[PDB]
Design a binder for this molecule. Structure first.
Ligand code: CA
Ligand code: CA
Ligand code: CA
Ligand code: CA
Length: 136
RNA sequence: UCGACA
DNA sequence: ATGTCG
């Protein structure tokens, strides 16, 4: 379809997978960075993509914005839709932080409401999502 | 056996 | 390579 420029685009950035994970949200039109998560020692790409969308949901809700959120992650979009992050990253002391954030994100989703449309960013047609990290 | 999204 | 879904 056509790009809805009046929106929020989110993405994960990592060093290894599993590895160090962070994420950010930007204004789709300008690329202005609206939020960024402090790096988490160990996590997966999908967990990060998931946390980015949920944070985007909370970010927009707090500001009473009805703008949609763009994510290029089929997995993260589904996890948010199901309000359940089906990650199989092992749960141990080293992954405790990322899992805490994931569990808290799920917790938020199951105790709050929103109608924010979560749209699939069509990378194969529009290029890389505006919140992207690293080379293509 | 892949196909796809990262 | 690894994380996930269809
Ligand atoms: Ca992405
Ligand atoms: Ca988070
Ligand atoms: Ca949803
Ligand atoms: Ca990237």
């Amino acid at each position: 379809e056509e790009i809805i420029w009046e929106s929020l685009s989110v993405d994960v950035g990592s060093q290894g997978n599993p590895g160090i994970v962070e994420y950010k949200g930007v204004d789709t039109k300008t690329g202005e960075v609206l939020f960024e998560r402090e790096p988490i020692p160990i996590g997966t790409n999908n967990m990060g993509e998931f946390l980015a969308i949920v944070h985007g949901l909370r970010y927009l809700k707090e500001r009473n914005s009805r703008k949609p959120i763009y994510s290029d992650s089929q997995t993260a979009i589904k996890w948010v839709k199901d309000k359940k992050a089906k990650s199989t990253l092992v749960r141990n002391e080293e992954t405790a932080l990322i899992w805490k954030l994931v569990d808290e994100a799920e917790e938020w989703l199951n105790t709050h409401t929103y109608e924010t449309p979560i749209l699939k960013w069509q990378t194969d047609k529009w290029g890389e999502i505006k919140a992207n990290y690293g080379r293509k």
